[PDB]
Assembly symmetry: D2
Homo-oligomer: 330 residues x 4
Amino acid sequence: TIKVGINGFGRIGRIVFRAAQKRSDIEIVAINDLLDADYMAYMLKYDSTHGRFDGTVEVKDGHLIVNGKKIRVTAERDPANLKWDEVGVDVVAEATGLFLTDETARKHITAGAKKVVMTGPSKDNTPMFVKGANFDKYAGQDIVSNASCTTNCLAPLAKVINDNFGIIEGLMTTVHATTATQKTVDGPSHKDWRGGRGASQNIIPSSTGAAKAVGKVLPELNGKLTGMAFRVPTPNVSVVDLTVRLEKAATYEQIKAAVKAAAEGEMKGVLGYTEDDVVSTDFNGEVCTSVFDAKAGIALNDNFVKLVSWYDNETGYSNKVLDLIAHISK
Amino acid sequence: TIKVGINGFGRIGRIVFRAAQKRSDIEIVAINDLLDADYMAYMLKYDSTHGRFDGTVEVKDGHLIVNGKKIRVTAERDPANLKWDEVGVDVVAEATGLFLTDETARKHITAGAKKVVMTGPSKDNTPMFVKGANFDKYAGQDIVSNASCTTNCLAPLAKVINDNFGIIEGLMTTVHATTATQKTVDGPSHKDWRGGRGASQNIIPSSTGAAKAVGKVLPELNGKLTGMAFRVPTPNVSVVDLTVRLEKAATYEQIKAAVKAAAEGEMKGVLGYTEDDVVSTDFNGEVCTSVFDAKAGIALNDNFVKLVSWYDNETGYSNKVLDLIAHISK
Amino acid sequence: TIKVGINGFGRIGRIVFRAAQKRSDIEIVAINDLLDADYMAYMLKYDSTHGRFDGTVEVKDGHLIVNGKKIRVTAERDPANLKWDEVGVDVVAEATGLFLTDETARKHITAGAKKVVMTGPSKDNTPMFVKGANFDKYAGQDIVSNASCTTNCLAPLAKVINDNFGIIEGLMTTVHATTATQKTVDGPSHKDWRGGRGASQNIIPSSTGAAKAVGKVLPELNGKLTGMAFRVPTPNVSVVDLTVRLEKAATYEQIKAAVKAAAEGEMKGVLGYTEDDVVSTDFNGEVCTSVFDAKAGIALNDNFVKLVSWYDNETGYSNKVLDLIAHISK
Amino acid sequence: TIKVGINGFGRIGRIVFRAAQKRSDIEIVAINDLLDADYMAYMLKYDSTHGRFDGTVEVKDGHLIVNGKKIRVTAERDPANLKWDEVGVDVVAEATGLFLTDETARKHITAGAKKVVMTGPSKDNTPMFVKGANFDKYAGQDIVSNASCTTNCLAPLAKVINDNFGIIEGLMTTVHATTATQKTVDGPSHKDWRGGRGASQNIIPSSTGAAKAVGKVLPELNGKLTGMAFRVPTPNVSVVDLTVRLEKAATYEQIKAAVKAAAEGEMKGVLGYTEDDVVSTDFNGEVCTSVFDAKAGIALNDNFVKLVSWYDNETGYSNKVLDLIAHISK
Ligand SMILES: OC[C@H]1O[C@H](O[C@H]2O[C@H](CO)[C@@H](O)[C@H](O)[C@H]2O)[C@H](O)[C@@H](O)[C@@H]1O
Ligand SMILES: OC[C@H]1O[C@H](O[C@H]2O[C@H](CO)[C@@H](O)[C@H](O)[C@H]2O)[C@H](O)[C@@H](O)[C@@H]1O
Ligand SMILES: OC[C@H]1O[C@H](O[C@H]2O[C@H](CO)[C@@H](O)[C@H](O)[C@H]2O)[C@H](O)[C@@H](O)[C@@H]1O
Ligand SMILES: OC[C@H]1O[C@H](O[C@H]2O[C@H](CO)[C@@H](O)[C@H](O)[C@H]2O)[C@H](O)[C@@H](O)[C@@H]1O
Ligand SMILES: O=P(O)(O)OC[C@H](O)CO
Ligand SMILES: O=P(O)(O)OC[C@H](O)CO
Ligand SMILES: O=P(O)(O)OC[C@H](O)CO
Ligand SMILES: O=P(O)(O)OC[C@H](O)CO
Ligand code: NA
Ligand code: NA
């Protein structure tokens, strides 16, 4: 098993922790955050979106005991002091949002970890990987990024469509759940003014991490795709609305068949496929990072189509963080 | 003064009523619905979205007294019995959703009205008129339709873009407020299964009335545009997300300049233009039916762009119902 | 195995169905509602509040196949035509809200069922039974009512407090999730004007079924308790806020000890007890019909206290419908 | 006119600013916060809850120009450096939540202001005042507190009830809108764990400032009243649910008459009175700090009653901050 330390116990850190409980290949052995262990235990035990933790959580001597296993709890501000080697950590899930460059994330390796996976898009040239788009390009790097949830939805779908029909150009929108960066009522957000406005009251235009990341994980599409977001008052699950022009003419049935074939074969567990009358809550807990909604999309003609794909922006991305941890450990 | 009877006191009927109070050329003299006058008064006085009625509302002898003026109240199921001539009604705002064909709406003329404006898309070939798209094609018809709110947002924007740059093809999404056809918790909706799912919990894919209507008010765009909707948990205000391929190359600044010129000139009061960091609640009460959001849109290249335009689906549409009543009465 | 037919596939009918899957003593063999089998299957499979159905759902020959078992589907408006004997139904879960009197519900017995459990308060003197209040008073009746969800929260708590300390008088509020009787935006509700106002926008004062029912299942408290509700914009889970004057002085720790003892002893699985920092979503899926929140309540003095108890108004009530079916079948 | 400086441009500071625009007796001449003037202008111009600012807002040379009047903008962390005398400030509205003791708030007087009104409950013995409860006790103090919104709702009602009928003991609940201290999704709130849980998803038990403040502004009720709160997913407007035992027997009609008499006389503009079928949005913008809801309350008997009173927790409190400023300046 791969021993993992989580740095940062926010939404991603906690859902990564829960996802790792259900996997035999990865074992969380340590968590670092500026939260007391008893408060960590509370945040783990109770979740408004995903329900009660499936297992036992004890606090003993400042550490967590989860399903009888001891999890080392620390509260280090400087990752260089984390002594990851003292708990045999192989890979660090870097989930604070604060260490998205090589120089900052490398402190985990100085502290004894072997590799680091950033749970967000890198801010320098640290390479990004998206399962179903470019895991096979990984080349042994000791620090990597799993991109972002929206990129994990867009890229697998864009790859199937491009590989089969040729994307000339495309624009996308994600209609995106409210997240922790937003405000409950109009409040200060000096670097993103719209993003300070009351989240439960508003449709809020925003920028998406996918516009900059998708051409990095699929270089053949660089400069051919961009987009934006609308944040809306739901607590989880988002949807990509991808408008593409195709080089090869394809009927909507042919598009469905290509997506379905990828979902049942090469991209199984990454790309999903449904023909049901689904809505966003039907993907709360979804592990696939891109679930194609066949009935929701619409074609104007054989070369211009709007495609719809769902993603649980918490669960899918967290599971693929673990997939990236496993992949770089092979 | 144009005397107007309102048939149906749902959301559109009540917001048309409020908007008519601010116009000197139109006076509401009668309302018909299966509601007691005291309940009509309550629904007019208090509005969760638009606040308290600006004026006085009294019930006297089974009728409404609004700002001191008597409004005749009736509860006729058959419009042929409405006796519109007894209150001097010129134009009926047909707002029940039940009489969207010539044969049904013409019962109002048999009942003494001179003209009818349907407050929804016609179900037969009753002509639709949308301000900023084709009011100038009106040619004396006594029964007309104002299309739908989404069509009133999309059509003025599509016209400016097509007239200046040529829309080869386009696909649109409206991210749309919850409406009265939706359900508070998962409930029966046998003709629209997704639409029965709990509105406050979900992003809900849906169809839009604008996909059929836009090519009818702008025949030059027939077959060139279609789209879909996502219903989201907000109570009012929606946004059109229009992705178009252009015949003539246009930079995003050139597109902005053209839209602003239309908003400040010919289409003033219909098309609006902003460069501010707006969110949906900033248009609660907006009278313009299409407010272009310059900063929210994004161009992939000089011939492929995503344009964003806001609309208060209650207020803008209701004001343009009144504009159409005035226009056909000239 | 008790064979059960469900009449009405609304929220209670569908959550009773799901809960029955986890019990070996009760098997659903038939469902009646004015829904096609494929639409019933969709409503069972996908739930915005409770997630995807845990099992397989297929439609075969107009009937449902659930976890491999055939469920007879019918669409009879008149319960006398339900032919319950043809599927060996023992007890009917009468969940339509339309047959809450002896004369109407007894049509199920004419149609071949042996007993009926109404899933709402009876409108005549059909006896109500609430687990943790008066199941032990059941004495062979073939038609009974399980009262309402709020009554199932209030009555077990009121009984423990009254039995130990003596309720002289009490007043309660339930802060209550939105339900299907409410409206998504301000709409017609001529028999309950406040209840027509947009559910997601408002705190809405309302009446509660528990104000009439509690004195019926606990006659010793008749005339000693009443209350009201506020409906709020959550999709499920509600909370009782009970303010009582006590005959016998009791400190808050003594009250806690008494409630905990009942939750751990006689009323285990009915009354729950927590000292954790819980919020409403922590009870989405809760089977206990009354979970006492020790830290939320507050005592003014040893004879005047405010007690707080949570309930999943869908899940707890539905499970106790099944408990009542089992109890009357003993 | 009284010249006022606002310290802190959060919800209270901004709604105080808007309220002062409509008053001739008070003129805002300066605002201090760590926000650029252009961002202050944006937060003032657009409000999700209260709509667009009624007036003009310009930014010039780092200062605000509002309806043509210059407002001095500063960004001082230490209030001792604010030079309030340079803009002739009489009274400071201390709205940061950070300076709720004599020693901290007195820095404004060192900086040249004459008096300070804290827009929250004091943390030391700085005296609190609530209009309709104890403004007439003000005795010239140069630093005062306006208590909190819930205390401004509870105290005027409790005073009428106690003065007329004698409160033996009472317990209250406020069902309270979401506020800026809450989180959009489950997040860190280490001093109030429940308060970190996702605000739009949950009913959240909480503590209320009124439990400690009400006996301070009405000493005759000290030790006779306390309570708690439930935070719910609405963006503004809250409601007090007051359960009281009365010394003097009073029918519910007698209680209504006493409240109505106070609302129309001595407490006019503080206590309001309605018999309408109201819901929370009907008080968005309400200036009265306590609006009694006659039809919502319920009496068990002539000495034990539940009373309901609404408050716009932003608008009412902000207007009474201005009232306190005017009162201490007499
Ligand atoms: O930080 C000062 C700027 O704030 C706004 O711009 C930010 O917020 C936008 C969303 O409202 C983002 O799109 C943008 O990227 C941010 O920089 C404001 O629009 C700018 O004019 C201010 O300079
Ligand atoms: O009415 C029976 C059909 O219901 C569904 O289809 C309706 O609902 C869809 C949204 O969920 C609409 O897109 C569609 O146009 C409606 O007809 C179901 O998907 C069908 O299989 C049923 O035949
Ligand atoms: O049906 C006519 C009456 O409607 C209102 O009263 C109903 O709605 C109230 C909630 O808004 C309930 O409390 C009440 O029990 C219902 O009867 C209205 O308040 C009445 O004046 C009307 O007669
Ligand atoms: O700060 C550590 C404590 O956190 C919790 O208590 C806080 O949060 C409660 C709401 O969840 C408040 O009622 C309480 O006043 C706060 O102190 C936790 O319940 C405590 O056990 C922790 O010591
Ligand atoms: O598309 P990639 O490069 O992530 O590869 C995914 C593999 O095919 C799955 O084993
Ligand atoms: O575009 P039309 O035909 O609605 O004409 C609009 C007029 O020029 C003024 O609104
Ligand atoms: O209180 P009752 O009468 O529902 O009896 C309950 C039993 O003792 C076990 O739940
Ligand atoms: O009740 P008080 O002391 O706030 O006094 C309010 C005055 O009567 C109003 O002028
Ligand atoms: Na329908
Ligand atoms: Na009703």
